[model samples]
Target: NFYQDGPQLSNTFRSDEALQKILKSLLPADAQKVALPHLEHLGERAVTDMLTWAQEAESQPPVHVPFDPWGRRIDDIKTSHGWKALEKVAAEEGIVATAYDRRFGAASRVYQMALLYLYSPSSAIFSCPLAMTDGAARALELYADADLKARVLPHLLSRDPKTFWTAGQWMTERTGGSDVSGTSTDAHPFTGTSEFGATHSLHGTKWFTSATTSQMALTLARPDGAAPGSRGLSLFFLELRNDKGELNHIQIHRLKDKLGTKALPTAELSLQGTPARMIGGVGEGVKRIASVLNITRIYNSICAVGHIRRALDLAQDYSGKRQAFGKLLKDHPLHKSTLDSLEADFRKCIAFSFFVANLLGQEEVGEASASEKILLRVLTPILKLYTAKKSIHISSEVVEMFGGAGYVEDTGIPRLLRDAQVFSIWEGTTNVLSLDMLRAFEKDQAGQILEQFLVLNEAGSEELVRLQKLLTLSGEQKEQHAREIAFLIGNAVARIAMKKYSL
Candidate 1:
């Protein structure tokens, strides 16, 4: 038997010409200069230590330790040393903290997400916790009581690994994942406890609590005597452990056996009299948690973009090394055509994802105009659904580019497809987000932004006309082409943003 070489990573960030071009276009010279040092550093780590850490995490998935030597109630999830190291990296690098620190003002989120973009594909899905953690920070900043913010925000944004806390979003249950209306976790008023004065104790089973090892989580639960459906639910902040470092009334039933992101520890758990503090008024859970959704969906899009970039990088590297039919794979005309097409599509996704990130930064800094806010609101879902779907396709094609070798587990290529599957299914499915986009257009007049985009890219006028007709359609007629309508708008927006890369 003989052995063949596989793709080896380079300095992922430095070698990413498209990323560099977009960053230069978006940031002024001074801002780029300020950001360059860390960007280069993180990119380099992707090739060095981070690469090994990812492999270690994948090889050693978290194991659930349900009991001690004696009969005990310890529910411990032991992750890999590499997994723990990446968490340290996320904290020290300020993955969640940078945006809140807002050093660059309106560009701060862009800077933070740029770091996330470079860091995600290498972090072995440690980026999962970062997304929820960042979302929790945003929600607390917006709607939490002053006391809650004072206690939690600093820890969530802490750069010190000891102080930094990752958070979980616990909206999904056996009842539903994306449909929060079916949320059955119930909460009751408590006299109050702790320095922050939590007012409720949650009790129910959470079917899909991801990153179960996170220190805290934001969850939705119905309050006692509240109305029914999503209107009855409210957002609550909870620490997973108590003063003595016990599981805060949380019982870990079992870890989820899943298709992708095996490194992340997702579990089925019960929150039995779990103490928590409600963030906003009763019956406002859906609207309140929406702030978190906006942040996480942006995270979702960037994560998806990162997947596409990594798959392309690996495939391109493999092509140059692998020979097919007596010629280098890259030298084959057919192979070159497939590679270029994927690269071209990848660039459009990058344009839209970072463009959306830039808009998020502006809005977070309170510098966004009313129109810009609406634009951000609409585009967030489009970017998420669009990029997530694109990532899956790109990964599938890249694996095909590798032929039989890609089908094997050892090359570490097939996992790209498996992991890419969650990007669309998580946060929201393609269909769910399409309907959300439809609502944004009709309720918030998000279509008006597309009209404005059309002014800049008149070549996409056909989409605008189609969007106008879809907007007028009522009932099932409009729903019939929701996905089509969303993509029309999404494609137009990406095309417009691609041109901005030249700036």
Candidate 2:
């Protein structure tokens, strides 16, 4: 997937000034809700409902409607500028939508923004994150066929109602989550005397596909006469045939009961001689898909930003506003101290998310050297896993700050914790990304990645300086013995504020 045009937001928010405007908008003039009590509980009624559903065990359809090209409340996409409300600031400054599209595509940005807004705030920022991700995949497939772009791009951009253009690209299988090169699925070119020009078909099933309900997907398989491993891989666009409810060769075997992103529909899809088309060059599937994966890793980092921000916002607000033992939770010096560190870590995550995005967006070449991609390759998971783990940790404490209320769905703390659990698993698991980071470090241009790290960690504050020292020692120590800098960076991020994640 190609990075499109989108704006990025600044790292800091003037909490005093910002809170005033936020509070004003949230408060009802006649409701005597002028105090923190009224304003605190008044926000995001939609989220309240989502938390309620999440706390329940029944797997009902998502309370929030999943957006389709033709879904109702079309105004959310068109007139009132519903989802784009965040897009304004996001596009102009705050990790702007433009930054997203500029890194991927305007269409990708639109899709991501739509999902983020449309999902009804169910701790499913992954929805928005994954949509932009799908958009990027679509852009890469643009190289496959301009006709395909014409068919899909317009519908995605217009946010048009009723025109189908679903995108899917997850490649996991029952045997594995990582080691995709080990994929056994095969695609053989058609040899039969078919009347049509259809060239190839797929055999085998994918274990976990994100939203197979989409009209098409960018997939990978072993091509005929190819050797084992990723070198033999070929890309395919598998279109699901939903012609008046008739099932195609591609079948939804079952929907997974995932721990997180429950709001999203993850499915096991079986491809039985499913018709397919190639994108880019043959046996270049792994290479081309890496491009898409790089962009996806960056977007994953951004999702971590949103995830951590929401978590921190909830934790901080809860600690400040919630009272216990005759005092506000934030009034407790110990709790206040912990929350302070959380705020710092939260800011770092946001900063690092954009920092990585900015570096990726500014690249002049799509195929940067192996080492050049390492910094982000390393940082993306650190961003994903680190912030995610922190969110789980911090949000749990946030519940504690709420006492008995926090454990229940009513407090919304536990749901945040549950949602954060998925970050370490999706995209790439923490360890999988760590391995990639180490392999990428073996390249010669590794220093260049380090240089970029220096740039992001510039303006060296005391904490940063301290972390650099620790990292220096870490390098020396690791040089004397094998070590994973990946974990070091994660710890570096946790301990040092600037080094933690701030851009």
Candidate 3:
């Protein structure tokens, strides 16, 4: 009778008061009604069946089994049954299909995003591939020729587990991270009237490819005689295996040993004679790939906030069961005050992310106003970087909330912080995204959105006015103040959403 009870997580969707209130505020009534049951169902499964699967996936991280016993190259990446089951669940649940279905029209993306959020923390980071898969689907929807679209789009949107597929984003190389101008991959086009008439062969090493077990990938390569730099790079879609299930001239070098997302299948790879069809046009990759970034960055924003909420839920539960100085942790004023501050911070992120979510849905359904579109552009990177950074901070807080139990890996609470680390690093780092915000401010002039919100909210500050003056900065001045500018805009925008939703 000397045992201490730990916290428990119940139905995440149903129990989430903040998510419920925020979604009710943003969604159209009929659309909200339609989405309610689906979200609740996913919430229940996440705490029960899916949570178990997530643990299994964590324990049995994917292995890079490169050859058969006979020494023939199979290059098979072996994943656990739990991971496989999670993939099936993603497809059957219409995680990707929801956006394309357009059944709810302008309400669709939020519905899809809501489902994704509830599933992610319990997904053991399976959402990694889902983000790329959704991004690839969006890019292909806009730019892929009818031939490519007809053949591959169905699988990406498929609701049936047997036919569904996940896509890889193989952009990072040994020479580049955010700067793809240094990409070394080369594409040699098939000669005039060859077996693969228009396709080409890829040759280079991809330094990092997350979700390497995917059926296909969208990669960047430069053609011979093409001018150097990013302008010369083109996007290509390649299937990972031939019809007979052999790797299509690709070799897996090794899996990445990372700080987190241990269950994800990330690899260093070499592509020699891998056939690929160039998407869009020669020298048109940079613009087309933005299509994917636009969507994935949104996914990143929601997933980060979702991770934070999951941590908070656990910590909130544990506070009751924990005791100190003959008092429960929740009953202590100091402890309650700290947790409330975290809760308030999380609510602010929810406002920004859900506001972005609703606007994205409207834009996807061809119903966004001009101002709405501009605001969406401004908020995308802001919300992405902001929530990612906050996720790490909040995760750290939640871990410490549990004291010694939090430090133990066996308790599974430590994974929250570990997984949260990648959110800021991937999609885009805080610095790179801040620079991007600078460019968007200069070009899209998204600073206008910040100014509008700052003034309308009676925010009682010279934030954007000070930022407007910063626009006069150039060269080193511009680079130095970039992050400051992004944070100012993000804080202003998020403040407005929190006000609007709370009001």
Candidate 4:
């Protein structure tokens, strides 16, 4: 006898109405025609395969292999067959490659993010590496020298597994999390140049670095006699190993035992006179990496919504099959209400997040108006901070919907809750992002930008009125009410974006 008691979530793309609607409205006619078939294939076939990959990857966590039979320090992080499959799938499906490929011009970001939205939940923790890789690619294109770009961009953008490369953004240190000014790494001028045109030797300890298996990383270090704080720091690129497969003046201290995203291989590392090449100007580390943050932060938002959507999908599917008391769980009004609320939350988050993605696409292709450029700057952090918190709430409620079964390990629902926690914590925490919003708001040009944006859209009119009032707060009151102002602004701007784009 078969007992039908488990969840049965359908293909991710097919189930997501909000995603489909947004793409139809945002993409141009030609690109839309091109994207629909590929999207349909992902929705129909790739998503299910990804679920299997995610399950297998989770079952076999990465093992830190530090030595060979001879007991020599051969620090190698060995991953599972599932992880390898996900990596290949990501490349073949153009997960990271799509934006760089630029097949659809300004609409490329929408396409790339759409693919990631489908892939995130099923990626186990592979999204971490993919996010960094996307950020790294953006940084190289915008800030790296021509020679560096020619050398690295091809690998980063390659769809072929043998040539495709991922990068690590190693910025966090023991001194601070969000405060890059507290960075303790030092980059001394190297005696001579090498094949990669190495010019500096970086010496520092990176406290938290995910994607340790990546071939290269973009990191921050202070020149020996530079000024203090973020001004002193400079951005540098370094390969993890030489062509001979030997560590390149770098040491893997140990992998971190993290709370969630268990499939990711996060490690502590020591860079002792590691050869490196500088990007952009000297002492421009913070500014250079800002480009990377812009891309990764959006990636964070997409992942947040993606995870929430997946959690709700599972809960919704379970409700129809599982019975309680007199009837099916979904038949009960209270449970239905709960699911409906989650669905609404999921939809709104998608609405605003994709809007930002669209704006980013326009900015990249030089099609964004002046007001849109400002809006993109202000909205990036706002969406990143707000959706992250909302995702946690949504995931918790999803677990509650499953009752006792959700808490058990084998149900596969617990990871949704576990992975959702990282969205708010990574990229930037809530408080840090709130301050950043304030910084953007207080900029001299911010007033005109908001004024222009408000006039062009109707839905955000109330929020703009509130923002004007908040701007009048002075001295102590302004500092005290910063987070509130940031939150209000995010809500209003997101509404405007939804109304402006939704056809």
Candidate 5:
């Protein structure tokens, strides 16, 4: 009875009951009051349309339109109608602006992230630009002078598509991976300050600039008189294009041929006397950018969970319709078990991801206690590392649910796996994050913070016993076993948190 017949998931947002429940449970009453309407609008209008747009946009990856007919070096990155439409949708939907508006106080992030959970899966990687924009806004607000904040924050928070601006985080260079200490970019004082006062000219080549279409960017540069390495670096804000819509002393070397996030325009850029304004004091770039990472990593985790959820939603629908060996796929015990396992993993990831989102919201509004602050610092790396790795695994497995159909490119299922692959690599790789977690443990009393939430002997089970042993391990031993210890801690904390929610 079945031939070329399987599930066809709806494009509408109302189908995502899981996300609806998550928003209801995670957000408090006042915040939920504001968020539900947005979620409904996204579900009814944005989600389905964006999903359709994403499929149509696949064949429309951004191109580096380097010149005009006469070859006069235009250096423009041309994108698809779908890409442009998605950007408009992002601006109209307040994807980046909601958190900045702060209508709900500390709970604002929870509300914003809930909307993002639904939006990210459908945005066709447009969330890439939105993440950087959010981080850049946060950085400027925290470290930049009142003048810079007043000038930039309004545009970054603008809900009007015509006026809203996206920002790029130009950090990666040929010389650096996660260790930005090897930064080679240099800055010198320019002739005079612009409307915002501080002025400098930066010169360097950025090897990997994501969201290259953004109007402005935050980058790191070493002052001419400053020392070398990260401590000597200072943060700078630069407009990617001047008022006349020309590159502001920036050259687009080429765009990257990436494995995933193909819709995003990742480019190699050269800055030659690019005008910029310094944020914070000289030699504080590394510390300032760390704040950017904290926000971006949270975005990474949210996207990771979102992609996994979308994959499972499709997988579950297919299982209901797919018939194998005389029975529907959902009727088969083995197939059902596979979907169940994926669901379990999906919920586990959501649990940890939202937990961190809540902490971020609390931290932002100054609602976090000293212990919560410490827990937040320690958990950021752990949450990001675990969820990112899991998304990749979950995506790959979800493809198997479709059998041969999954391997077909046109089905749109494989993109889930491809896009999910970047999660572990971006923000930071698993091993790199492991080292970061260990460093946090060493620098802060990270273990003491963990003690506040984790009940080592609560269950008195083997898992708890192992956790107790892990807690007791010497600092040297923990550092040596960093990845393992981080995973164990993350797993234990997430499970405990889920139980608190009665999951």
Candidate 6:
């Protein structure tokens, strides 16, 4: 029954058990104090111990999971039963847990939709982030006052999902998206305090908002009587409930028809002194949002990887099952060579993603120094760019590998190709990452750290050394081109790390 056309975890049952054991070994003592009710399933004393373990694991960057932000993962968490399991796990383990309700489900849906597009390129996923936006806003409510958190977050915890804050981001105006500072939306400080709709109000307009149907929006505005160039700008978390169109304060002026993620409506809106609250500090809107945006970029990288993995599996399945000239296509030497190369590529991406995530998670547990921050800055964009670009190629190749079956909707490879093509263009684009990489290189320190890390990694493993060398190859004569590419990418990443450290 275990006929794998693609890779599987080593000894699925034993590996899972070993992972649990390893997880138990990872936590600190104080983590046990906050254990939730369900830790009893694992053991009482062990429950505390396991919670400590979960904390340590969470503090570290996320380890890539086979099923994450896609497939049944989002739907399971959004449902009543799914939400309860997560709550129980978090309570017993005493760690932060996330669930993507309808509004926030866009993250997961986007991933799934992309896979659908890749697997069945001819059809459409009709992707939207309505559920994801809802879930994101509901999740944010958890950070609000106790009463507010209880009203929204708990409703989703209950049999019914709640809709309180509608979540959307205002990154663009009529002017353009690349230059967010050009936005003209305005926010004025309110003198009173009531809750949700008090203390601050916003005016002007927000263009390029996802989930305009949402009740809660995270918007950017220029504070009253301030200058421009991002110094005068402020970010606000705004609400639009309890009002009709006349007093509604926000109008969905324009909804764009995008090529991908179409299910989530992108809107341009007019904000008329809509109530607002600052997220971090004044004049730090860009900085604060950028922090979360970093996380979003990582999420996008994972999504890209997942789509690529799914495509490879689909291709592998077809190669094994389909016949070409009377033999299973996978039986041919040429087909096998391609398949093996694909596996190597997958392994490299997975390993790199794993290593980077580990570094990121460690940074979150404690304060990352200026240098560490710089390194992360450089690494993040590289991840976004490299993974996005590579996945596009791999996905398209998978369609070709799938042959005629891939061309039709029934095979679904074509959709996978279509969906994956957009990965590089969205979430900062390859070109932007390239510029960021170059910008960070100007710092020098980031470069030093990356160079150090690469050397250390290669020195530690034969496989890593070989892989690094393979990356250097470009042409038949220039085997080191792979290594040169690695060096350039490393240099690009280090460029940012240096600046972050200088700060």
Per-candidate TM-scores read: 0.97, 0.70, 0.96, 0.96, 0.95, 0.63
Evaluated at residue 377, the lDDT of candidate 5 is 87
Model 2 spans > 4 angstroms off: 1-59, 62-129, 132-142, 191-198, 242-245, 364-378, 451-484, 487-503
lDDT of 1: 0.88
Off by over 4 Å in 5: 11-13, 192-198, 456-458, 471-476
Candidates sorted on lDDT, descending: 1, 3, 4, 5, 2, 6
Look at candidate 2 and tell me the lDDT of residue 258.
65
Q: Each candidate: what lDDT?
A: 0.88, 0.52, 0.86, 0.84, 0.82, 0.49
lDDT of 1 by residue, 311-413 (tens): 9999999989998789889999989999999998898899999999999999998888888899899999989999998999999999888889899988898
Give per-residue CA lDDT, model 2, range 114-158, as digits (tens).
223222233244244344434444454446577655554543333
Clashes of each: 0, 33, 0, 0, 2, 49
Candidate 5's error at 80, in angstroms? Answer: 0.6
Give per-residue CA lDDT, model 5, range 348-396, as digits (tens): 7887888888889889888899888888888899999999888999899
List where candidate 1 sits over 4 angstroms from the true fold. Answer: 460-464
TM-score of 4: 0.96
Q: What is the lDDT of residue 32 in candidate 1?
A: 84
Residue 336 deviation, candidate 1, in Å? 0.5
Which candidate has the top score in TM-score? 1
What is residue 459's positional error in candidate 2, in angstroms?
8.0
